[PDB]
From a paper:
The smoothened receptor (SMO), a Class Frizzled seven-transmembrane helices (7TM) G protein-coupled receptor (GPCR), is a key component in this signalling pathway. The activity of SMO is suppressed by the PTCH receptor, a 12TM protein. This suppression is disabled when Hh binds to PTCH, leading to phosphorylation of SMO's cytoplasmic region, which induces the translocation of GLI transcription factors into the nucleus to activate target genes. Here, we present the crystal structure of the multi-domain human SMO in complex with a specially designed TMD ligand, shedding light on interactions between the CRD and TMD.
To facilitate crystallization, human SMO was engineered by fusion of a Flavodoxin (FLA)16 protein between helices V and VI, replacing part of intracellular loop 3 (ICL3) between P434 and S443. The N terminus 1–52 and C terminus 559–787 were truncated and a single-mutation E194M was made in the hinge domain (HD), which slightly increased the protein yield without affecting its stability compared to the construct without this mutation. The resulting SMO–FLA construct was co-expressed with vismodegib, and then purified and crystallized in complex with TC114 using the lipidic cubic phase method. We determined the structure using room temperature data collected at an X-ray free-electron laser (XFEL) source at 2.9 Å resolution. Since the room temperature XFEL crystal structure potentially represents a closer-to-native receptor conformation and at a slightly higher resolution than the synchrotron structure obtained at cryo-cooled conditions, we describe the XFEL SMO structure below, unless noted otherwise. Analysis of our multi-domain SMO structures indicated that the nitro group introduced in the TC114 ligand does interact strongly with K395 in SMO as designed, and enhance the π–π stacking between the benzoyl group and F484 on helix VI. The CRD is positioned straight up on top of the TMD and is supported by extracellular loop 3 (ECL3) on one side and by a linker loop (residues 181–190) on the other. Furthermore, on the extracellular side of the structure, helix VI is extended beyond the membrane surface by four α-helical turns, and the top part of helix VI is tilted at a non-proline kink towards the CRD, protruding into its hydrophobic groove and bridging a key connection between the CRD and TMD. In the vismodegib-bound structure, the glycan partially occupies the cholesterol binding site precluding cholesterol or oxysterol binding to the vismodegib-bound structure, whereas in our XFEL structure the side chain of I496 from ECL3 extends into the cholesterol binding site, also precluding cholesterol or oxysterol binding to the CRD. In fact, our structure demonstrates that in the absence of sterol binding, ECL3 interacts with the CRD hydrophobic groove to stabilize the CRD in a ‘closed' conformation.
Residue numbers in the entry:
A (entry chain A): 59 to 433, 1002 to 1148, 444 to 553
B (entry chain B): 59 to 433, 1002 to 1148, 444 to 498, 505 to 561
The structure:
Amino acid sequence: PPLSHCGRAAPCEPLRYNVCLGSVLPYGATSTLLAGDSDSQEEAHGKLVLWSGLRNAPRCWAVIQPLLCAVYMPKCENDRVELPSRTLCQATRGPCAIVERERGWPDFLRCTPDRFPEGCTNEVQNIKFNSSGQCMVPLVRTDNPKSWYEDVEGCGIQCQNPLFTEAEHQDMHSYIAAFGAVTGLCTLFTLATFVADWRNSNRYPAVILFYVNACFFVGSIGWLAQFMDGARREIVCRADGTMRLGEPTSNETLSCVIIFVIVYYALMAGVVWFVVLTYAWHTSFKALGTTYQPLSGKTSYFHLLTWSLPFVLTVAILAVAQVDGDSVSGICFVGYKNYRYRAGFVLAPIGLVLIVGGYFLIRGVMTLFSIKSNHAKALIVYGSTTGNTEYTAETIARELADAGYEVDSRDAASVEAGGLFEGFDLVLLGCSTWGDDSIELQDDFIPLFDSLEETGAQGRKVACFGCGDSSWEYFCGAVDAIEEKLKNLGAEIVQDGLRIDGDPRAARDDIVGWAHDVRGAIKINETMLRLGIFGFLAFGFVLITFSCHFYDFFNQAEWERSFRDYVLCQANVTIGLPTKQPIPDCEIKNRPSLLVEKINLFAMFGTGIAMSTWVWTKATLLIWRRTWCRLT
Amino acid sequence: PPLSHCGRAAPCEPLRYNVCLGSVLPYGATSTLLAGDSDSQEEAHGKLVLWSGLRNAPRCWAVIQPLLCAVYMPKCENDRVELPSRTLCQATRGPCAIVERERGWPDFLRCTPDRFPEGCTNEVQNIKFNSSGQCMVPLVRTDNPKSWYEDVEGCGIQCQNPLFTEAEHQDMHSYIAAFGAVTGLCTLFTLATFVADWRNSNRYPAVILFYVNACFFVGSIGWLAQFMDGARREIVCRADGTMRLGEPTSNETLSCVIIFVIVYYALMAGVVWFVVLTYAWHTSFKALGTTYQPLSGKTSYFHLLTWSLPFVLTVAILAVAQVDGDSVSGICFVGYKNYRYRAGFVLAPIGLVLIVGGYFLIRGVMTLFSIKSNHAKALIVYGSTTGNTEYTAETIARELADAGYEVDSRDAASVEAGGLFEGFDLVLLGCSTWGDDSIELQDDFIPLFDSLEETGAQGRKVACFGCGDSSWEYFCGAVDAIEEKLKNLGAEIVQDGLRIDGDPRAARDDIVGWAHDVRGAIKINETMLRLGIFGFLAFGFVLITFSCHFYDFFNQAEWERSFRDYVLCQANVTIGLPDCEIKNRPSLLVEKINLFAMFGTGIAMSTWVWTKATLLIWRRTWCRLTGQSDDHHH
Ligand SMILES: CN(C(=O)c1ccc([N+](=O)[O-])cc1C(F)(F)F)C1CCN(c2nnc(-c3ccnn3C)c3ccccc23)CC1
Ligand SMILES: CN(C(=O)c1ccc([N+](=O)[O-])cc1C(F)(F)F)C1CCN(c2nnc(-c3ccnn3C)c3ccccc23)CC1
Ligand SMILES: Cc1cc2nc3c(=O)[nH]c(=O)nc-3n(C[C@H](O)[C@H](O)[C@H](O)COP(=O)(O)O)c2cc1C
Ligand SMILES: Cc1cc2nc3c(=O)[nH]c(=O)nc-3n(C[C@H](O)[C@H](O)[C@H](O)COP(=O)(O)O)c2cc1C
Ligand SMILES: *[C@@H]1O[C@H](CO)[C@@H](O)[C@H](O)[C@H]1NC(C)=O
């Protein structure tokens, strides 16, 4: 028999509607007493149309359907209305959290033991509700609870990024394919020539560039993996069809974490190897100049920090499980869902490598500049009858002085040969050619030339100059004669002698140009100069990468808000009221800049392409020549 | 009955001496009236002893004996002395010319019709004078009037030279035999080789040497003829036994003129052929830069001069007849008796050949310092990283340039392999070795090395150089690799590669030395060089021959005087009244120096055919004349 507490006294009225939310009712009489907002059957039906807006977020729709029928259209028999049980009310509370977040549970729909008593026959339990509901365009029906997006239980955020169009996806994928393929090809070539000359190329100053290339090559594979037949969807989408978030996760393939490790580890190992490059260039200077020695046996110290620090970071990300997948970039990365993790694991280490790496580039430049000031003394000895070589000597003297040299210009007529060149870094000898039948040096240079053995030319950096006339046999013969004696004594001829035809005043810029080139030939370690250009080149690209990561960090807080606001509005679970126009009324107020990402990738992949040019010398042609030759 | 004019009135005195100059007198009384210098018989006898000094020069002694007896010891019978006939007086005048030349005929011995009447009975005509006189040691009795020495009629100068001993004659004859036989043998060998390959060897710059040898061969025969058994005495001595002087002479054998023509003609034809040799070298050496053959038409004009000039001179000597024989030299020559003819026909032509021949040798040395600077082209391509090979290349370049080459020094980095070697006589490739585990060529040389096929190396004269370090295994591996590829392409590697260990500045003179030796192995005209040495060699020997002939010319005037003074002194012809010696004579050493320089020219010129080619000439001669080919005949 029915319980007295499971029923309430109310006047029974015949059912004007034979259907409740698509399901037929076994009874013929109802009551508008249980629904506090409705007075009539026409009003209760009107409220059900507003409540049917919860079709979206179906895991709520399945439990809210019988409860709404048990309150708005209940069973009335012999002036008694059937009350809905407490279990029917409590079943909605969880999955229908959206109600309390949007509209709020009304007085009559809250689980009060007075309104919803314990252990009552629901009547709606016998009634079968076939209707399931569906998920709106941005979302997708997922059975997996781990794939449910916020409030909307039963639905999940789709794999393809809803903020960017298919056209933008195709455009970004073409951009990664182009840069990835070039960087992959270029670095492969560099790794190949290094192993083809492995015993010789293992020398510590240049071996850094092999490992710098190794990282960008491995990184290229991670970015290009998305291009294999259907790989992108194995890396970015979950088994059901929703985007991968908060990776490493249970009951899902490793395809996302594998590609993340390849991309992030190689990115971090590469930036640590850049700091090794900056340190090495900086320390190689003080090995010759002052006291510091080459660390050509630091294999167990450089490989220690370059392979350990990215390992600690990669392991830490998998621990906090912040590996998120993305369709536009086609890779799994740290902090796509939560911007804070991308800032902590990417922006902070890149900032640390720029300050530590930048310090070494500044230090080495300061060492380069201090060495040049200790090698800036120059002696200019000239032999001139008519003053043409005297004028050239003076013109050379100002160009060196303007460049930071301490020039000492002397006339050969007023000099003593014994120990003349002692205390000078550069010695420039100038002499005009005389003699009709033959080559005769200018009269004042003869005593110096004859006793050139006593000057201290052995190992001295020298260059010759002089004035002559083409209208004479043996043009600038003095320059030839001086260059020959200096070469025989052991001097280091810096440049081919400046031979002036005619009036030197008209060849002013030739003299200025020669003196410019003569300082240019003063080598401050050619083998180490390349290491410095590559250091400053890598810094430039790393600085652009940092800027782009800073833009995303400083703005993603607003983009995440806009992502939430758009997806939740598009979910169409407007329980409260019907819109003025059918109009969708959903827009993205602000989204991430794809240009900034393209600038980021250009700077990233560009470092790999820039560092691969380390092996773009004549020596490399010779390396593969021996290989082919010796293979044959 | 005796004529009144064939006798004079004088007091007869008995003969104190029964003998007159070794002959007994048929009468017993004499007179001292006919002899104007003698008053007594003791005085007349005393004058006969001074007159008996004319025993020497017997052509005179035989006729003066009866005349001296008919004047100093005449027949006196019944206070009448017999006068000597005019015919007895006139018979002495000719052969006793010495008397009138030295002392002069006295008043009583001159043929006056008063003192010597015509047609008188000379009682001395019945008296037989057995004495015939004598000729002292350097002279010898000759019946031939053409063989009589100066005033001494009946005697002639002996064949063997009185100024030189038999010991000196034997010594000089041994010296001529030795040099003559060697020169004869050596020149015969050279004449045989030029004939054994006449066609190939008839080339005109070199065929001069065949005719130069031909003259010394013929000359050798003339000098050696004296060694044929008894020949020397047929060449040097006249039929009687006196030395041959101014041969061509009547009723004497041709043995002296034959040997003279052989010796003098060959001596003169040889010195004219020396002037041809000097002229030919001078003109051929000058025309080396052009195909112009200067000795082309001249060939005929060369034989004209060399065979006519000695002929004209030989004929001229036979005309002036100054061919004199000599025992010490064993040959007949021009101007042995009169030094002036030897000076004119021997010293003057030899002086003329030295001034004309000397001019051409000078002109040829002027050509030597005109031609060197003018024509060799050399390319030096180097591969240098550290500048060591660049420095070596420059050191090599300045050395070739100093020697007269036109050097083109290039860096391998700035060269195109395609026909790179085209237009150069010499190509010098330089490269350093690189590579840690192996041999790797200097970086700039690799493109050139790889396309070395296209350089034009086939048959090109090349040499390699390069710097290395012994500290690295495979020292100068690049030098090895380059000359191996060059050898495989068909190039001519001139010298083994200059491989520098360490700094080339410390090995400067080694580079200088190597560069020098590289220039040498480039073949030159060895035939022209050889012609020039033989020209200067022949001049040297001719200059010594001239010196020796000048010594004899400048001194024989004194030697001729000493020859006359010594010979006439020994003779002892005392018309009426001891230290007989040679004051100065010719130097036999000077003659030995003369022969050494003369015969030495022939021996020196015969060495022209002392090459490897000659061995081949006689190899092909034997086989060819043995019927077989290089194995056996087909
Ligand atoms: C994350 N995100 C979203 O749209 C997004 C997705 C999910 C949620 N959410 O809440 O679930 C929120 C968002 C929002 F709020 F919009 F950000 C963007 C994805 C695209 N994009 C990129 N970012 N980095 C790189 C790059 C450069 C160098 N290395 N890498 C790794 C990169 C490279 C190529 C192309 C794009 C790139 C910027 C951020
Ligand atoms: C000439 N005379 C006389 O003694 C002589 C003879 C006769 C009178 N006289 O009045 O009747 C005078 C003299 C005198 F005054 F003594 F000289 C010497 C003879 C020997 N001798 C030589 N001279 N030439 C040659 C030779 C050199 C190159 N070619 N030839 C042909 C030669 C060769 C070999 C050996 C000796 C040689 C030196 C001179
Ligand atoms: C005697 C004489 C010889 C010369 N020989 C040469 C010569 O060998 N090579 C040459 O290039 N110029 C030659 N010149 C030109 C001078 O080198 C030229 O004028 C030069 O500019 C003079 O230099 P100065 O003014 O420094 O003394 C010669 C000029 C003279 C008058
Ligand atoms: C990497 C290296 C490899 C070398 N290999 C060789 C070698 O195999 N054999 C050798 O003789 N020298 C070798 N050397 C020495 C050089 O040939 C030497 O320094 C030379 O003088 C360089 O001359 P350059 O200035 O013309 O280039 C080597 C030197 C270096 C630095
Ligand atoms: C919401 O869903 C209902 C039912 O599917 C549909 O009629 C309506 O057009 C949707 N509204 C919007 C704005 O998407």
